[PDB]
Amino acid sequence: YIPDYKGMEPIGANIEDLVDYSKDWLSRARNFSFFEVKGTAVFECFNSNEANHCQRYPMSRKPRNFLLIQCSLITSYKPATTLSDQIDSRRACSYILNLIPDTPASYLIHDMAYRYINLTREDMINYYAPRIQFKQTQNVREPGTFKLTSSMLRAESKAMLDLLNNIESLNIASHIVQSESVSLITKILSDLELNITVLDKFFQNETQKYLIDVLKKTTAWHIGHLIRDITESLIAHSGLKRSKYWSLHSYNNGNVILFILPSKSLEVAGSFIRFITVFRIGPGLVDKDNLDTILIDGDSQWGVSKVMSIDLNRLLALNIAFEKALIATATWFQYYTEDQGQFPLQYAIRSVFANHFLLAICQKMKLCAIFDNLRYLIPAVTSLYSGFPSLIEKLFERPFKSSLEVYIYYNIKSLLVALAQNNVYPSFMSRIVYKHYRSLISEVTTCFFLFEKGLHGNMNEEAKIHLETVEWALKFREKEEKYGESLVENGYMMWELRANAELAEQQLYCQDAIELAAIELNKVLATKSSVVANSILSKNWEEPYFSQTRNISLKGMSGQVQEDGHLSSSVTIIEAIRYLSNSRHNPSLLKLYEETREQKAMARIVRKYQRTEADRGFFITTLPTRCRLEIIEDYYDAIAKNISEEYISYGGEKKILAIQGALEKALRWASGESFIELSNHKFIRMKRKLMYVSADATKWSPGDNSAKFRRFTSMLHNGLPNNKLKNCVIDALKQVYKTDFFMSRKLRNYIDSMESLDPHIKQFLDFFPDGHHGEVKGNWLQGNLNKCSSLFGVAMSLLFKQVWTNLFPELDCFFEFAHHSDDALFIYGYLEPVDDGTDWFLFVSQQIQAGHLHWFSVNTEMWKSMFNLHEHILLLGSIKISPKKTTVSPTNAEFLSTFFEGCAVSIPFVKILLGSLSDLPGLGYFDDLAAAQSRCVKALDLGASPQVAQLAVALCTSKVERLYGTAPGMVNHPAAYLQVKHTDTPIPLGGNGAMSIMELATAGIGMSDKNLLKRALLGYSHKRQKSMLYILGLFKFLMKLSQFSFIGKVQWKIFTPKSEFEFADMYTSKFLELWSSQHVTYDYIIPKGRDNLLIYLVRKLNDPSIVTAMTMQSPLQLRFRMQAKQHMKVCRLDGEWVTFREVLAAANSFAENYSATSQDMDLFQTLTSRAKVARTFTVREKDQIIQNSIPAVIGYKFAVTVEEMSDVLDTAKFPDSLSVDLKTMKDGVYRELGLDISLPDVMKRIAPMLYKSSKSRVVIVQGNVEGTAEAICRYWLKSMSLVKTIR
């Protein structure tokens, strides 16, 4: 039942009024939005901005710090061990104790060295003992720490400790300051380059010889490992029970020392690890001006650095600095090979590695912002027209504090000026000149991704994300005051626009414009009304609201306005349980809207933690607000699925294929000739062309008026027999017009716990009458109505197309539009005269003299007027194209973060390769390894070479093994316990997963276990080998102990909270277990009943994996804590929680005593037996003989109760064909896999991988490759060599 609501009646708007308004609009000179790119223009912009800069910032004489860790090497570096650490610390402290301190930090390190050298023998044993062998002592209360205290610290050291406990810019217009910095970063970079004192066949001659053999001798390659060791030692002395003590470590035969001070643990947010690095002055990361002091010892100088405080983000970023720099250099290597057709020289790759390492070591936010703006500037100076004046003026909205900033500046100033004179792409980071723009843009993008996400000041960004919303809400209120509420809400009409012409502003919309846009979109929709209606009804508006995973998910949500006033922070599942508890029924989406219609919409904002400067916000809304948004979004997603110009409606892999196809039709059009029918039969010849506008929308959601959608929905065709659903959608849009937006508790506390209520914080607190929430109108909040706003933009673009077509019927232009929310691409196909324009100018003059004055806008550069009118018509719908981040170029496009050179894709796969090093699922060794390898395979699919991917895979595997302890020689190492080699142990048991990218991309992510099982089977069955039987016993241990690992996998619960959450004690554990046993169908389908659903959700609240997920503050807390948890008991065995070593011991015990039964063997032999274009890949053959879904059939088999059967039939596309499907399904599993699912306890294990066939793989092939999987595999085979043909 759909409720009854009042809709909107048409106002009878005719396109002819808009066409006449456009004729009057285009008859005058219009100021273009973009400035032509000329060398003199860019040079003068830089000069004027340099001159202006110094008068806006206080002058700075002292360059600031940019090196997070300062250290130097003169000999090769061997990895640190415990004995090496002991000997090196002894020697280094003996060295330091002979120095003469002069600064407070020097005195502090002197005292620490004295304390370490005056430790007892028992103290040293307990200091270097393992966890299981450590015995506390008066001084060494923890392993790897000691205990200083007052009376063991000089006054000059207590002064430094109390100082710890308790914007000026550099002259960039100066040549003394701008050359003193280039001579500092060019010796750090010139010291990091000094040499210190089937796929494998191709990798050994190309990548291993020209990249990994050249860099393996540099100072950077060894300082990377030294800093890895230093960061590991810092991570160890950061956990709870340790961070509050002192520590002292030594590296490189005592040449480097690390004095770790007491500091807050990094488990609690907002804490820093404090350390000092005393080293031997030499080549490397040494900035002598930012060292605390330099102490001489006759001949050798020792550099004592400042007390560095590093948070967990930067600390974990410095631990993978070597891997990050190496991956970036390996990507630059491949890009150079593809650009110049030959391998780089030694010096080039060495300098590239040094630059990447320096970037990865200096994890500052100022440099991150500079590199964020550079990737916008570079596209703005290699294009015909752009907004480079604004981008450059923004580049100077920075104080340049460190030498590394005034060096990257000095480089950008030269690069951008050189690029504007050659429109031959000079390199930003080497002395080479590229042949393609993609090489340079990818080179700078890689340097942008060397900085981590979330380097901003935490509270600064918490304020920034609120000020934008408050400012635009105030702007909307001011517009309501000027023109009244009725005009701003219902929108103005054309006759008012003509009389004012200032009504065409943002947050204001024109009724006639939206009605005509809806009619233009109807011109497409009405041709497929049945399809649109069926797609709308396919959204299942009658199904219960809380039986959908998105409505019970783990994502954040808002609750109630607590007594404090703030809006509760909760989870979606918590609110679902709360609603069901106090309800009698499971309400449909529409019936839950009737009970929550009068409850105002509420919202809160949280940080998104982006890599870009000026982090953006994310909105968390209450349950009524979510129901409204789901109604609107279901309606508009169903409608927009059938509009090709809407790109959100694509799955995510189809966006690139669609934009490529659009560009192909554009190019096909351009390969033609236009003929304008001059009087009589004479024809004027015209050459077709194309111009690409990479439009970006300014303040998409903030500067908007959601009311424009209510009219838009009214006129928008859907094909349904009545308007009940349309009226409901209009009503939902009405209910989201006004929102109560709440300040975060963090920001409210900060403002309250303060004394300087300065301006810009007094007009911010006036938005909230009670100081907790304020009313926002018009704005629909970021990300809530994406598919509605994008569809509206598409409609307005189509309206512009129609208006231009009516304006110039004689001409033959070609418009292509792509919209993806605050991102668009416009291809304008215009005509130009051939040879001199003797006839074209005459025709234009005749038309202008005939009364068609608007032809004044097509005399020359049609595309200029095309874009002017398109922009104006878009503004009439309250859409503003960004004059800064929009680029116009006839031979280059940028869309969806992907670069196009007409019809050639270029995707930054570096982001995927570097993301595999961090942000792991953290569900255990097997899951994390399979996730890192999956992310490397994805990079391979996005265009990474089979050799750049093979290096990233090696790095990821090594890092995962080191982070879980399974690499050779550590705790959890299988060889210590198991009797088989590291290469023969199953991966779930710490086995060596070291597998080629070429087979991880085709066979799968978990075939190493399957290959091992096949090898063991063959060996045992052909020779009766005892070791093979041992391997089979390990496999059986994993199978009983049971990313999908069919042969089983250790079950981990890494996180367990101290506090239980709301509505978790409704049903006791015994009752939940009994309910799970009785109702087996509810393991594969969500109950469609209040009682069953409530019990199901309470049970889901008591799932270890869900418990771990709900207690997780970013992946940083995982990669941070795991170093300790590998010792702790985080695995499941015998029904309790034990260590992974205990699991290894149990596996060894069972395998050693394992015997080959007949069923085990039966099951084992049942188990073992050019143009860079984008295409699709398909690894699964057609097995779709099932009409219903897999959950429906699996639940149907176990369906016995009437309620269970009813819940199964509701969750089925074809409830009348379940039984047949099941039978077919059985055959389909017994004819391909040989497993009988009818047997109990068999189908439960097989099911979790029957959930497949949806992996829509998109691969960036070289163009000649067909879409077949075999063709793509052969292309990967042929691409194993970088600079050779290996057919």
Partner RNA sequence: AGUAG
Of 305 and 570, which CB lies nearer to RNA in the complex structure?
A: 305
Q: Residue 2 CB, nearest distance to RNA (Å)?
A: 50
CB of 453 to RNA, least distance (A): 12
Q: Cβ closer to RNA: 547 or 744? A: 744
Distance from C-alpha of 151 to C-alpha of 630, rounded to nearest angstrom? 66
* Residue nearer to RNA on the CB measure, 314 or 324: 314
CB–CB of 146/245 below 8 Å?
Answer: yes
Q: What is the C-alpha separation between 1093 and 579, in angstroms, rounded?
A: 12
| Pairing mode, strands 247-251 and 256-260 | antiparallel
Question: Rounded to 5 degrees, what are φ and ψ at 305?
Answer: -85, 170
Conformation bin of residue 284: beta by default, left when phi > 0, alpha when psi is -120 to 50: left
For residues 301 and 955, give the distance between their C-alpha atoms in angstroms, rounded to a whole number.
36
Q: CB-wise, 59 or 163, nearer to RNA? A: 163
The total number of residues shown for the chain amounts to 1287
Q: Are 294 and 304 in contact (CB under 8 A)?
A: yes
- 780 touches 628 (CB < 8 A): no
Q: Which is nearer to RNA, 66 or 977 (CB)?
A: 66
| Cα 212 to the center of its chain, rounded Å | 29
| φ, ψ at 665 (rounded to 5°) | -65, -35
Q: What's the rounded Cα separation, in Å, for the pair 622 and 196?
A: 60
| Closest CB 1279 distance from RNA, rounded Å | 39
User: Annotation-wise, does 823 bind a ligand?
Assistant: yes
Task: Output 163 or 424, the one with its CB closest to RNA.
Answer: 163
| Residue placing its CB nearer to RNA in the complex, 68 or 716 | 68
- Burial (CB < 10 A; 0-12, 13-18, 19+), residue 175, is exposed
> What angle in degrees, to the nearest 10, is found between the helix axes of 1190-1197 and 1202-1210?
170
**Two structure tokens written together for 542:** 């009658």
For residue 432, how many other CB atoms are within 10 A of its CB?
17
For the chain, percent helix, then strand, then coil, each to nearest 5? 50, 10, 40
Distance of closest approach, residue 399 Cβ to RNA, in angstroms = 7
Output 67 or 1034, the one with its CB closest to RNA. Answer: 67
Q: Residue 646's beta-bridge partner residues? A: 819
Place of tokens 């016993």: 1033
For residue 1175, which phi and psi values (nearest 5 degrees)?
-130, 180
Residue 746 CB, nearest distance to RNA (Å)? 15
CB 366, min distance to RNA, A: 6
Name the region of 440 (left: φ>0; alpha: ψ -120 to 50; beta: rest).
alpha
Collapsing DSSP to helix, strand or coil, 1176 comes out as strand
Q: How far is the CB of 314 from RNA (least distance, A)?
A: 7
* DSSP bridge pairs for 607: 617
What is the token pair recorded at 1121?
Answer: 């804590």
Rounded least distance, CB 310 to RNA, Å: 6
CB of residue 289 to RNA, shortest distance in Å: 10
CB of 1058 to RNA, least distance (A): 28
In the complex with RNA, the residue whose CB is nearer, 118 or 749, is 749
How far is 1035 from 1167, CA to CA, in rounded Å? 12
Q: Which is nearer to RNA, 274 or 1088 (CB)?
A: 274
Going by C-alpha positions, the residue among 711, 900, 717, 707 that lies closest to residue 818 is 900
Instruction: CB nearer to RNA: give 66 or 826.
Output: 66
Q: Which residue's CB is nearer to RNA, number 157 or number 386?
A: 157
* C-alpha–C-alpha distance, residues 789 and 740, integer Å: 21
Phi, psi dihedral angles at 200 (to 5 degrees): -70, -30
Closest CA to 265 of 230, 234, 227: 234
Q: Which two tokens stand for residue 715?
A: 């006129």
| Least Cβ distance, residue 1200 to RNA (angstroms) | 60
Cα 1064 to chain center, whole Å? 33
- Looking at residue 363, its amino acid is Q
With residue 864 as reference, give the H or E element that holds it.
helix 862-876
State the Cα–Cα distance between residues 1029 and 542, nearest whole angstrom.
56
Distance CA 1265, CA 1177 (A): 11
Nearer to RNA, 460 or 553 (CB): 460
Write down the least CB distance from residue 270 to RNA, Å: 9
Q: Which letter, b or e, does each residue of 564-581 get, where b requires 16 or more Cβ atoms within 10 Å of its Cβ?
A: eebbbebbbbbbbbbbbe
Question: Shortest approach of RNA to residue 447 CB, angstroms?
Answer: 16
Nearer to RNA among residue 55 and residue 166 (C-beta): 166
Contacting residues toward RNA, per CB under 7 A:
64-66, 68, 163-164, 166-167, 272, 274, 290, 306-311, 314, 363-366, 401, 455-457, 460
Q: How far is the CB of 754 from RNA (least distance, A)?
A: 14
In the complex, least distance from residue 307 CB atom to RNA, rounded to whole angstroms: 4
CB proximity list for 1001: less than 8 A, separation 6 or greater: 937, 940, 941, 1276
Residues 239-261 as b or e (16 or more Cβ within 10 Å = b): beebbebbbbbbbbebbbbbbbb
As annotated, the binding site for Mg(2+) includes 823
As annotated, the binding site includes 823
